[PDB]
């Protein structure tokens, strides 16, 4: 993978955030499996002005119109088990259930979000997830370009001893939780 610090300017909506992330990468690929996760990822870091954002990626980004005045960028290749390292992350805990008139949506509170998350990591890296328990988007009018929704993210943080390296790294590259294209998924680690 490879990491960059980038910052869009004029961002009014989340979908245009997605599009500004894909229009700077020409050769794009998508390798999918029926039920498993798709194989960029990204995290919103400062949103009231322009919008600074950390991107994880496979294909190299170069500045575009109204981009940075420079191409930071580093290419990284990943992490010994038993050792603790800093984590991080935004995701959307949900419960899907039959809806009157299907619906994404202990169990809310800060304890089934912790249950949900450590479910997400599973045998990979053991961690503690900052529990949130509370973003809107609409289509920019372009045909076949989504529509309008709501949503709710949660950020999580600390050091996460990993129990399987290739598989937590697998999780780092695949992403944790739905809506990866709308801010979620990216797990960030650092040595303790």
């Amino acid at each position: 993978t490879w990491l960059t610090k980038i910052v869009p300017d004029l961002f009014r909506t989340a979908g245009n955030l997605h599009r500004k992330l894909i229009r700077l990468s020409s050769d794009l690929g998508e390798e999918r499996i029926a039920n498993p996760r798709q194989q960029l990822l990204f995290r919103i870091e400062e949103t009231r002005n322009e919008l600074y954002l950390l991107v994880q990626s496979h294909s190299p980004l170069r500045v575009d119109r109204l981009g940075p005045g420079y191409h930071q960028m580093r290419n990284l290749d990943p992490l010994d088990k038993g050792s603790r390292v800093r984590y991080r992350i935004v995701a959307s805990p949900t419960k899907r259930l039959g809806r009157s008139e299907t619906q994404r949506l202990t169990w809310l509170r800060g304890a089934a979000a912790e249950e949900w998350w450590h479910s997400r990591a599973a045998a990979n890296g053991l961690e503690l997830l900052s529990t949130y328990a509370q973003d809107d988007v609409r289509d920019p009018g372009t045909a076949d370009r989504s529509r309008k929704i709501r949503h709710p993210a949660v950020r999580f943080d600390g050091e996460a001893v990993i129990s399987d390296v290739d598989a937590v790294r697998h999780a780092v590259l695949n992403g944790i939780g739905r809506g990866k294209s709308y801010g979620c998924g990216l797990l960030s680690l650092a040595l303790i």
Binding site: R84, L128, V154, R155, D157, G158, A190, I192
Partner: protein, 329 residues
Amino acid sequence: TFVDIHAIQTLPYSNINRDDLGSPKTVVYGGKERTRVSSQSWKRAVRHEVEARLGDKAVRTRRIISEIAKRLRERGWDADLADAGARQVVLSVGKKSGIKLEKEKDSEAPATSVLFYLPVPAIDELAAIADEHRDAVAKEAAKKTPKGILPADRITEVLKSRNVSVNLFGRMLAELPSTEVDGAVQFAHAFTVHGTTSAGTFYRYANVNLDRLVENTGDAQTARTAVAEFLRAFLSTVPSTLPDLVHIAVRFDRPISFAPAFETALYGSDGYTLRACQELNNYAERLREVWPDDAIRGYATVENKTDLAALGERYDSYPALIDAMVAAA
């Protein structure tokens, strides 16, 4: 007259307190960032274990009116009279017209603007005071803007009642400064000995001002149980591991935290427990030489690799240490 307790305790990642964004709270101390557990959190864990073990519980609530309403409703009052009577309870006291209330919420009694902190049986006694004046409450319930009919002195005397937690940690009420109680415990923010960028070996410190705790409870025997119970809660509880080392000093002049001992962060690569215990030992030795005192010291440790001579007489167990230093005070 000052009992201060020091403690080194490694902690698991899950038990750490979080900030507003989910990251564990940190101090940039000694120039190096060190994760910390806020004092109010561990203090809350201590007060709940103390109330649960000593049996008497105090309640810090913004919704006192609703609770008085359940007691008046179980006394045979109609729901509307129970609500009007509890409003009379908070309306009859304070300088201004009444205790200020938050904006009214649909279907529920309004919360007071400030958090009341009173024992549970005192809330029930407030219900009894609103109960014996049921007819006057019924008459003021018919008026558009009822006034505080209940006696103010009786209610203020109920609101002055102190739990062990109130005696120990103090309370504050801005509208009723007569009820404010000075806390007898100083609880420091537990920070890591080493820089952390979570897990680590936290340093923990706390004071107990015996003169104020004896002044609050009045009798020295309940203060004695309160102190011993506090120290045991300090060692046992986790905000939601046992401390690696504990050092109770009974000092008469002034309490002294050993937090400067760990201002120079430990380098690492090796287990911080032995170096933290040995460093707290050297700082305790150097302070007893620099600041001479007759304070009764004493410690209890898991590691046996070192004698740690400066921390006073060694005791085999934490309860033996607590009993010896409380009996020494």
